[PDB]
Amino acid sequence: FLKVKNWETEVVLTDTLHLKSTLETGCTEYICMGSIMHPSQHARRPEDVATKDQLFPLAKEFIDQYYSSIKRFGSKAHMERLEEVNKEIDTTSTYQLKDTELIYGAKHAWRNASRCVGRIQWSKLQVFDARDCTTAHGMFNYICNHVKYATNKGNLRSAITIFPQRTDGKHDFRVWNSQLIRYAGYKQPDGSTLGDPANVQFTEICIQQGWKPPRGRFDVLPLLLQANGNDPELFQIPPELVLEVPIRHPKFEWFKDLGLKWYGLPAVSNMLLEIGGLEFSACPFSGWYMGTEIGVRDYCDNSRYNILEEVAKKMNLDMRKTSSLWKDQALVEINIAVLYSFQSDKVTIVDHHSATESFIKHMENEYRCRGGCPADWVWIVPPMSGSITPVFHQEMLNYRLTPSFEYQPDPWNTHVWK
Amino acid sequence: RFLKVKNWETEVVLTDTLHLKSTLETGCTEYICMGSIMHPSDVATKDQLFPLAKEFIDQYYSSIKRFGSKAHMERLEEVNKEIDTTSTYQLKDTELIYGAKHAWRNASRCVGRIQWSKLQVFDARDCTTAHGMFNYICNHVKYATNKGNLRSAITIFPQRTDGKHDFRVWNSQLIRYAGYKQPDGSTLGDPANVQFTEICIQQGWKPPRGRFDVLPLLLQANGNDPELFQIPPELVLEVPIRHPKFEWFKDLGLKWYGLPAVSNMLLEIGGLEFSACPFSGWYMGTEIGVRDYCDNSRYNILEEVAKKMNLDMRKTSSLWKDQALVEINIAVLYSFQSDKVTIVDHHSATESFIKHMENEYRCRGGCPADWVWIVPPMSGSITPVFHQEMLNYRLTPSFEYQPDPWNTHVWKLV
Ligand code: HEM
Ligand code: HEM
Ligand SMILES: Cc1cc(N)nc(CCCN2CCC(F)(F)CC2)c1
Ligand SMILES: Cc1cc(N)nc(CCCN2CCC(F)(F)CC2)c1
Ligand SMILES: C[C@H](O)[C@H](O)[C@H]1CNc2nc(N)[nH]c(=O)c2N1
Ligand SMILES: C[C@H](O)[C@H](O)[C@H]1CNc2nc(N)[nH]c(=O)c2N1
Ligand SMILES: [Zn+2]
């Protein structure tokens, strides 16, 4: 057993769930790697098509967990399912999940995501089974339906669309975009960057593939979709499906003249979903924003839109020295504007005070019913005003449970073109 | 073996080899990370002390480029004699200074370590009574305060012997404000110090019962009962807090003390334990402006400031707390700078820490750093440390936490 304490409330929780952790964290009793982005390469199954003794134990573990979850461990259906999975692996080197298992696996991958502050919502996830997809055109159709469903005219709904699992590693389905909706970035001749600097490389691949860039500050990128290991294909998302919020400020009438906007739907498309040894390399999922993701990171990171200087100028702050806290002062006003703007357009958004309070409640729920909740303090604490949120004062234990979402390489680093 | 850390803002990659020198526990395991746990988890025998002493003497003679020398070998022989005959040993003055500086250098939770080699070390190992401790501490406060031009310093009292004769400063810091619980459930002064305030009162302290009463010193020598002393008021430098634009801010009546002086930690050098070792530097503004003033469990002034700012406090999404938090921290920095009392803002402090970290990697092979503590409690991602991967491990000499003395002390009077 392990205890975590909240230093504000003195609430103490006792963790037993960590006994079921599967993968290394990267830490040891002599070194802590808690602030490393990718601390571990420990995987549950090796590189490509596993042998029977490598895959079946992982499948058995997941099926056991699923049938335990529904109070049917050792039931007739449980033992038949094991026999069935055994024959599938025997004859195809893989196996196929039932619809119920796929849904259970996706929801638990979200429930197990230690870096996600939004998990109080984990059981309210709409799962779209796209495992019958065969072409990039079919992927585009599935993604359009996902975006329209999840956007829901601003009343956002969490969703995941799951394309065919990896087979041999040469027939991967991939969304080359990091998110379904991102803005292009362009290297300028004078050395600067127009648009989102984070997407410069992906933007160049799109242009190189035939995309005609309008070369503005907020150009929605095309989709670059790879089916069954083939070369990726470009598609324009119909603009009526792309909900955007123009950013204005409730007090500063000049703020609108900065010309800022953002999109409403955060839709991660570069991660891998791992369920029982199966690897779903294309599994775009979406929820709704916490305001700081846009107002602190997207807008104010030095390597992103980097707007602090512009905003502080318009505010007439003393920008001569750091100790005037002009960056901090502008940072708050920018984040007021983002929240005010989404709320004014009735687009779902959560501020970091409400989000972190919900997460503390979610932790307490999980310790009561599940005996723990894996949580990564470095990622859960918001990137502004940290200690005036309750999660700053909350001790957390981090460990890796399966099913899970994993990072994977960018496909342009691995794809051999045809 | 090597380990790489990356900065995701700059893409600089640093290579850590120094971590191979750790041999004490982080608290984590191969399958669980406890990096956000505040405290993960009588005296050394002869056999335990031998290898600890050797490792320290070895590293000291290596630092002065005398490893393997005649002097090195004779020092090791001398140390082993003392352990064999007395069950402990005594550091040379050079070794004490080196060890104190390196405990600071090794403090993975400290963002101010670019200053580590400029530490003034006061050797107080000849002290025998609480009155002598009081004298040493007054001299430290006066030296460190230096009329506002603060200088880092540490004063080292005699090491633990059998654990029954410990020297302890019972205060958590040398200068702190009292807190008083009221019958109606409210608190006057600093809520963090209510418990220590009660102990002082019970020992005979007559409290003024104000909002900013400087606490007396409660000093324990040689395992005896602790004794009360009033710090001479002219040695306590304080800064009234005002704001460069809001003339009403001074009406809040806020002030703080200039000298941050930690007195409840333990200094370990070569297996020796210095249970009383108060040390001091200068403040980073957020320590006062974010934590001391705006923690819900501390002075908790966000509401009053947001009121006077005419902020909309009905909804969290107005970010009224965030807005008030920034102005309070502007006031703290402005006030200290106007009074010419050393202070550093979190932007300057984290920039210097990154420079320090890179230098340490280049010349030492690494820099143990605790991201959870290094990143400031406000505006985290607009400081460079937020984007810097770090490795946390325990090197010795080190500063350690220890139990509060009133939880272990067995009283003697009547
Ligand atoms: C419903 C509202 C949601 C909110 C407010 C939310 C919030 C967040 C935030 C703020 C982060 C940190 C992201 C960053 O700093 O870049 C995060 C990470 C994460 N979220 Fe959630 N999230 C939500 C829904 C979801 C859903 C539906 C899923 C999956 C089905 C999910 C899976 C994850 C994962 C795996 C991570 C960490 C991996 C990574 O981003 O590198 N989240 N979340
Ligand atoms: C010179 C200016 C210094 C600055 C600006 C500075 C800054 C800081 C800050 C902001 C913290 C976190 C404190 C907290 O959040 O409660 C810290 C922790 C720490 N500091 Fe430094 N510090 C300085 C000097 C020193 C000195 C002189 C020593 C010892 C010789 C020292 C040893 C430590 C240790 C051991 C910790 C972590 C242990 C703990 O506080 O729980 N620091 N420092
Ligand atoms: C579903 C969702 C909701 C939300 N509110 N925010 C996010 C942001 C995730 C950002 N995360 C960055 C690292 C990565 F790119 F590798 C994977 C995605 C996702
Ligand atoms: C020397 C110094 C300088 C500075 N600028 N700030 C500090 C703050 C240390 C706070 N830390 C809290 C936990 C503890 F009480 F156990 C030990 C002290 C210390
Ligand atoms: C639970 C969490 O570890 C705790 O609140 C820590 C977070 N980081 C901190 N960082 C600093 N500098 N000081 C602190 O007291 C804390 N508290
Ligand atoms: C190195 C460090 O871990 C890295 O900058 C992390 C810090 N915490 C974070 N937290 C969130 N939510 N998102 C991030 O991208 C990061 N980046
Ligand atoms: Zn760890």
From Swiss-Prot, chain B:
Identification of the protein by name: Nitric oxide synthase 1
Residues annotated for (6R)-L-erythro-5,6,7,8-tetrahydrobiopterin binding in this entry: 36, 372-373, 386
Tissue: Isoform 1 is ubiquitously expressed: detected in skeletal muscle and brain, also in testis, lung and kidney, and at low levels in heart, adrenal gland and retina. Not detected in the platelets. Isoform 3 is expressed only in testis. Isoform 4 is detected in testis, skeletal muscle, lung, and kidney, at low levels in the brain, but not in the heart and adrenal gland.
Purpose of the protein: Produces nitric oxide (NO) which is a messenger molecule with diverse functions throughout the body. In the brain and peripheral nervous system, NO displays many properties of a neurotransmitter. Probably has nitrosylase activity and mediates cysteine S-nitrosylation of cytoplasmic target proteins such SRR.
Binding positions (L-arginine): 173, 282-283, 287
Family: Belongs to the NOS family.
Reported modifications of this chain: Ubiquitinated; mediated by STUB1/CHIP in the presence of Hsp70 and Hsp40 (in vitro).
Subunit structure: Homodimer. Interacts with DLG4; the interaction possibly being prevented by the association between NOS1 and CAPON. Forms a ternary complex with CAPON and RASD1. Forms a ternary complex with CAPON and SYN1. Interacts with ZDHHC23. Interacts with NOSIP; which may impair its synaptic location. Interacts with HTR4. Interacts with SLC6A4. Interacts with VAC14. Interacts (via N-terminal domain) with DLG4 (via N-terminal tandem pair of PDZ domains). Interacts with SLC6A4.
Binding-site residues, heme b: 110, 401
Subcellular location: Cell membrane, Sarcolemma; Cell projection, Dendritic spine
Notes concerning its domains: The PDZ domain participates in protein-protein interaction, and is responsible for targeting nNos to synaptic membranes. Mediates interaction with VAC14.
Domain of life assignment: Eukaryota
Gene designation per UniProt: NOS1
Organism of this sequence: Homo sapiens (Human)
Organism taxonomic ancestry: Eukaryota, Metazoa, Chordata, Craniata, Vertebrata
